[PDB]
Design a protein around this ligand. Sequence first.
Ligand SMILES: O=C(Nc1cc(F)c(F)cc1C(=O)O)c1ccc(-n2ccnc2)nn1
Ligand SMILES: O=C(Nc1cc(F)c(F)cc1C(=O)O)c1ccc(-n2ccnc2)nn1
Lengths: 181, 180
Amino acid sequence: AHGLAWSYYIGYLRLILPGLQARIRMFNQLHNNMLSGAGSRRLYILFPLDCGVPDNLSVVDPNIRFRDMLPQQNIDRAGIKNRVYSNSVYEILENGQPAGVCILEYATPLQTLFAMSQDAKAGFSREDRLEQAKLFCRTLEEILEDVPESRNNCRLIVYQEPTDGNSFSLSQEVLRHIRQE
Amino acid sequence: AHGLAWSYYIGYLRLILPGLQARIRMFNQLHNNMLSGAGSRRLYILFPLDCGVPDNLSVVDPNIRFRDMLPQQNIDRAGIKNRVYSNSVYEILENGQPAGVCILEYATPLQTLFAMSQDAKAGFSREDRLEQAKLFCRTLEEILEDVPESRNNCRLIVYQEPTDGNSFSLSQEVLRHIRQ
Ligand SMILES: O=C(Nc1cc(F)c(F)cc1C(=O)O)c1ccc(-n2ccnc2)nn1
Ligand SMILES: O=C(Nc1cc(F)c(F)cc1C(=O)O)c1ccc(-n2ccnc2)nn1
């Protein structure tokens, strides 16, 4: 879990965070300042301790409408010439009404904890996986503290879906994070 | 390291290997079948055990020259709508003359072992890093043999490039694996 936190910061957040505000700048110029509230000039990393990583947010919850991509950023990265970073902008709805707009993705290494929890040889329990997901969640911040960009640029949304999955909506969790801030 | 093998397989290779031949085929249709050879239709993953992951292949070896991109694949992945996957095709020179064409990139997560080795608080030596690199490699090899999509789509190029000197040719290492 220590290794995943470092890996994620070094493999991704280190590369995308620096150039993110420049990309919001141009997005607002061309899309009539959709991302106005400084609260929505941040990257929102969904960190379900669930360790579930679905592909489509509109499918998990229909109240997270996809509205637009950021502008693409091309980085020369590890033997890829012009690796392409696309980031998705979402509108969050409440009772039919647009209650928010933000840059939403999941922390992908979390699926590693899930996959590894299920391995027959070196597997472990849902409760041990919950513990490793927390060590991950905690460790990312201590690395995160030291880097001047970071805090202004992205925010972790940490959450545990009930044993069902119902009685819980992810739109409500996202809305309560932007509103609190 | 156990964690990096699973993370690299689960979070990247799982996603990109199934579409690769379909992408090589469209590429071949628009680039006078540049990837004609059998050696030319694998994703080759550079696995330097020194965990040196530089960003440019023409800079590391002048006999590896960028030719073109595969067509992109668009994948809905962990809240990114149409996340963009690209892969780079390179001509491999021998005696100043084109000898091979292939899809080439580094195993990015090795950068983690490198940064950890450079961390003053980690207390993680170069000897300890090499042992993790080898364990990463091995655990990745064990995952890939156990998956059908690896057989004709994926090849690990694992090398121990010495600290100093020029006795190691990445180009020739790549041309070795390409012909086998
Ligand atoms: O290693 C990669 N990804 C990951 C590795 C992890 F270990 C992990 F836990 C999560 C990921 C992840 O991508 O989410 C990776 C490598 C190359 C490219 N790529 C090259 C051109 N276009 C895209 N993209 N991703
Ligand atoms: O987690 C990622 N990457 C990695 C994570 C690792 F733990 C690692 F060791 C290596 C990587 C890597 O990408 O090389 C990641 C996540 C999202 C995006 N992305 C791309 C376009 N929109 C979003 N790209 N990468």
